[PDB]
Structure 1
Amino acid sequence: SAADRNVEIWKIKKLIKSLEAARGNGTSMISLIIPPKDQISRVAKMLADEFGTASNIKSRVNRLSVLGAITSVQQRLKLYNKVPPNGLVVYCGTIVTEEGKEKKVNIDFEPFKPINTSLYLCDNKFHTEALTALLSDDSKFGFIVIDGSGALFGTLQGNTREVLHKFTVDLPKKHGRAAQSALRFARLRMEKRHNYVRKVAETAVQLFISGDKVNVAGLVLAGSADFKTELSQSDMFDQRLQSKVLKLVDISYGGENGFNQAIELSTEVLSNVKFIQEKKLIGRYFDEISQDTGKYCFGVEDTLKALEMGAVEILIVYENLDIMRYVLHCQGTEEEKILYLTPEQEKDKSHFTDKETGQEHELIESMPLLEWFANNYKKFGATLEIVTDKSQEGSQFVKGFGGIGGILRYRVDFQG
C-alpha cells in the first residue's frame, strides 16, 4: 500500500532525526551501512579485524566502548543470514544524554528503498548523511539502451542502479548479393529493423508506465548507430512516454556494460531536472503576481491564513526555512496560543507576558514549521512543493518573498 509506505518513510525520517542528535565520546559510534548485493561474511570479517585493531587503542574510555560496539554489530549480523534487499544499515554506539545517562544503543534496519552506498565510520556522532540524501532524491529515472545486438531497460535513483528488462535479437545482414533482390532485401531489412523499434517501444510502455501515467520523471535513450534516434523521432513511441525523453546518449558498448557509461554521460542532464521543475513552478507562481489575478499569497502571516480558509492549490516553501511553530502556555489561567516565529523573534522575546491577567506566559517548546507543513499538508489543499534558492526566480522567492507562499484555488481578498 501507498499509505503504509508513507508511514514507514516517516518512521525512518523520525529515526534518522533522533540518531543525528545523539552524540557521545571520542569515536565510540559505529556508523555502518551495507549495500544489497554484498555478502555478510565479508562484513563480519571486516568488523573482526576492526575489533582487532581497536584492541590496541591507547585510551581507556574510547577503546572499551568501541570494542563493545563492534561486538554488538557482529552479533546483529549473525542474526541475519543474508544482507536483505534494500541493503542493511547498522548504527552501534554508546550515547551520552541528559541525566548523565551513558546508554548503549544498536539500531539495525532494512531501510525503505534500495540503497547503493557502503559505509563504515567511527565517530562521536552517527553519520546519517547518506540516508537523508536518499530520502530527498525520490526522482526515479528510466534508461533505455538501444543497440543492433540487443536492448536494455533500467532505472536509476540517485544512488541505485536497476535492471528492469532486456533482450537480444537475430537481425539480418547489411547487404544482399543480388541485383534485383538487393532492393527487396533492403526493404525487408528496414521492416525487420522497424519491428525491433516497435517492439522496444511497446516494452517501454509496459515497463515505465504505471496506471496510464509514467512513473519515471526522466527517460534516457542511449546506444549508437542512430537507433535511439529512430525511437525518439518516431510515431510508434507513445507521446506520454516520449514527452519526457531528456537525453539521446552516444555510447560505446551495449547492454549492462554500457548502462553505467550512459548514466555517467547523462548525469549532468539528470541533476538539472529538479532545477527545471522549480523554475516552472515558481515561474507559474510569479505569473499570478505579474498579472492582477490575486490567486498568489506570501508570508507565514498570510499564507497560513489562506491555507486555513479557502485553501491553497499549491503551497511553495524554501527547503531551509528558519520559521518555527512554538506553543505558548499560561501558568495560572491555563490559556494558550501558538505562533510562527522568526530566528530573532523566537530566541529572545519579552512579548510573552500575559498582560491582561498579569503573568509570565511561558513558551513551551517548538515543532519546526516546514516539518509542520510536511505533517499536515494533506489536511490542507495539498501539493507541498519545496524549492531551492538556485534559480533566478527561486532566489527572488527566497530572498524577496521570504521563501514561503502559495498558488490559490480561487481569488482571495486580504486586509491588514
Structure 2
Amino acid sequence: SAADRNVEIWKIKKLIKSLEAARGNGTSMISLIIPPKDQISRVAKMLADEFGTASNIKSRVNRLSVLGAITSVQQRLKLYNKVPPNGLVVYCGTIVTEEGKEKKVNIDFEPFKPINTSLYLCDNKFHTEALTALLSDDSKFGFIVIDGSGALFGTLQGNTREVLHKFTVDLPKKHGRAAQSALRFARLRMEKRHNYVRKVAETAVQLFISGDKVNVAGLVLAGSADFKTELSQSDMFDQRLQSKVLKLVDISYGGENGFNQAIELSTEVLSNVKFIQEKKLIGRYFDEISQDTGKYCFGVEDTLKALEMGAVEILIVYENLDIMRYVLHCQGTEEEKILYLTPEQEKDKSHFTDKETGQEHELIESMPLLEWFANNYKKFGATLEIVTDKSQEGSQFVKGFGGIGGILRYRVDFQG
C-alpha cells in the first residue's frame, strides 16, 4: 500500500527527533532493542535479577528512579506473549524539560523493516544507533548461490538475512566406462547440467522482479568449481539482471552454512555501490558544461530564477548547505516575503529595515534549506537526488559550485 507505508515513514521520523533530545538525569534511562527471532521469555528472566541487584545503588534518588522505571517495563512486555516481525524498541525512564518539570515515559513499538540488533544501556538521555542508520540504510542486494548439490536465493539489507527460495537436484557422475556409448554419454551428461542452470536463470525471474524493473540496487553470484561462470555468462541470462552482477565469489561450504560466508567475502564491494551511483551524476553534470547546448544553473539566485518557471529535472544538491530559510514580517505595513541568507548575513545584520516607510523589519522563525526543498520536491519537478562530496569528482563539486545545480529540460534563455 502506497498510503499505508508513507504515513509510517515520515511521521515516526519526527517522534525520534524529540525523544533523543530528552536530557533527563542520573542514569535511569532504559534504552533497549530485541531482534525478532528471540523469545520474550529470555527477557523476563534477565530483568528479574535486575531488580534485587538494582537495590544496592547507594544514592537515594538514582536507585528509586531506576526501580520505578524497571517495574514499568516489566508490565509492558507481559502484554507481549511473543516478539513480532521486525522486533520491539522499548524507551522507558523519566525526563526533565522546560520549566523544571519531571514527566515519566514508557514507549514500546514494532518498527518497519526486520532489524537485527541487541542493546541494553542506562545513560542520562535516550540512545539511537540502530534506528537512524539501518532504517535510513535503504538499497537492497541479491545473493544467488550455485553448486551441483543445490541452489539458494536470499537477500541482505544492512544487518538482516532472508532465505527466499532453494531447490536441490540429483546431478549425475562425470566418470565414463565404455567406448561408443562413452562419446554420446558426454553430451547426455552435460545435457543434464543445462536444464539445471536454465532452471536457475528462469527461477531468477520468479523471486527478483517488480514493475518493469528489478527490486534491488545491486547483485552477487556465489559458488565453487566454476558454476557461477555458467549462469553469469550465458545467452539465457537476462540483460538487466546480467548488468548488475557485481561479484564472482569462490568459497568453501554451500546452502545455509555458505550463505553467511558470501556476506563477509564482499565487505569491500557491498560498500561501493552509492560511490558509483552518485559519481555518475557528478560526472553527468560536467558533461553538460562541456557541451554547447546550455542546460545547467549555479547559485541560490539563478536556481530560483529558473525553478519557479520550467522546473528542473533532477535537482542537484550538496546536502550540507549552511544557508537556511528565514521568513521576514514588517511592523506597521504588515508586508511579508521569504528570503535566504549567506554565512555573515544571518548572525549580526541590522540591514533588515523596511526602508520604504522607515520601520523595523523583524524575522519570524527559520526552516532548514535541505528540509524546505523536501517540503516541495514533487511540486517543482520530481526525484530529490541528493549527492555527496567524498569522490574524485564529488570533491571539486561543492567548493566549485557552492552546493547546488539543476539540469534544465528545455532551452532556458538566461540573461547575464
TM category (shorter chain) comes to: over 0.9
> Offset at 1:157?
0.9
Q: Distance in 1 between matches of 2:302 and 2:61?
A: 54
Does structure 2 retain, via aligned residues, the 8 Å contact 1:40–1:82?
yes
Cα distance change on mapping 1:248 and 1:183 into 2, 3 Å: same
- Larger CA deviation: 378-387 vs 70-79: 70-79
Q: Deviations over 1:97-156 (max 9, x none)?
A: 112222112222111111112222221222222211023321100000111110110111
Counterpart secondary structure, 2:162: coil
> Offset at 1:343?
4.8
Cα distance change on mapping 1:271 and 1:69 into 2, 3 Å: same
Q: Deviations over 1:11-68 (max 9, x none)?
A: 1211212222222113222221111112112123233333443322223333322223
> Offset at 1:267?
2.1
Does structure 2 retain, via aligned residues, the 8 Å contact 1:175–1:182?
no
Q: Distance in 1 between matches of 2:242 and 2:390?
A: 28
Q: Distance in 1 between matches of 2:29 and 2:355?
A: 49
Considering fraction of residues, name the structure with more helix: 1
> Offset at 1:73?
2.3
> Offset at 1:382?
1.1
Match of 2:66? 66
Q: Deviations over 1:372-405 (max 9, x none)?
A: 2223211121111122221121111222212222
Does structure 1 retain, via aligned residues, the 8 Å contact 2:311–2:381?
yes
> Offset at 1:344?
4.1
Structure of greater Rg: 2
Does structure 2 retain, via aligned residues, the 8 Å contact 1:19–1:128?
no
Question: After the TM superposition, which residues 17-416 of structure 1 pair with which residues of structure 2 at under 5 Å, given as runs?
Answer: 17-415=17-415
Counterpart secondary structure, 2:41: helix
CA RMSD of aligned residues (A): 1.9
Q: Deviations over 1:332-363 (max 9, x none)?
A: 43322222334543333323333333333322
Cα distance change on mapping 1:201 and 1:285 into 2, 3 Å: same
Q: Distance in 1 between matches of 2:384 and 2:394?
A: 16
Counterpart secondary structure, 2:366: strand
- Larger CA deviation: 340-349 vs 197-206: 340-349
> Offset at 1:9?
0.8
> Offset at 1:413?
3.0
Counterpart secondary structure, 2:229: helix
- Larger CA deviation: 291-300 vs 186-195: 291-300
Aligned length: 416
Q: Distance in 1 between matches of 2:233 and 2:6?
A: 38
Q: Distance in 2 between matches of 1:329 and 1:51?
A: 57
Counterpart secondary structure, 1:347: coil
Cα distance change on mapping 1:299 and 1:49 into 2, 3 Å: farther
Q: Deviations over 1:254-282 (max 9, x none)?
A: 01211111010112101100010010011
Quote the sequence identity (%): 100
- Larger CA deviation: 301-310 vs 149-158: 301-310
Give unmatched runs, 5+ long, in structure 1.
Answer: none
Counterpart secondary structure, 2:134: helix
Counterpart secondary structure, 2:78: helix
Q: Which consecutive aligned stretches of 4+ in structure 1 deviate over 4 angstroms post-superposition?
A: none
Does structure 1 retain, via aligned residues, the 8 Å contact 2:112–2:135?
no
Q: Please report the TM-score for the alignment, with normalisation by the length of structure 1.
A: 0.94
Cα distance change on mapping 1:67 and 1:165 into 2, 3 Å: same
- Larger CA deviation: 401-410 vs 187-196: 401-410
Cα distance change on mapping 1:79 and 1:347 into 2, 3 Å: farther
- Larger CA deviation: 392-401 vs 223-232: 392-401
Q: Distance in 1 between matches of 2:115 and 2:378?
A: 28
- Larger CA deviation: 255-264 vs 98-107: 98-107
Q: Distance in 2 between matches of 1:308 and 1:213?
A: 32
Q: Deviations over 1:304-343 (max 9, x none)?
A: 4422221110012223332212222233433222223345
Counterpart secondary structure, 1:108: strand
Q: Deviations over 1:207-240 (max 9, x none)?
A: 1111221111111101111111111111111111
Does structure 2 retain, via aligned residues, the 8 Å contact 1:154–1:162?
yes
Q: Deviations over 1:152-185 (max 9, x none)?
A: 1011111111111111111111223222222222
Cα distance change on mapping 1:96 and 1:356 into 2, 3 Å: farther
> Offset at 1:285?
1.3
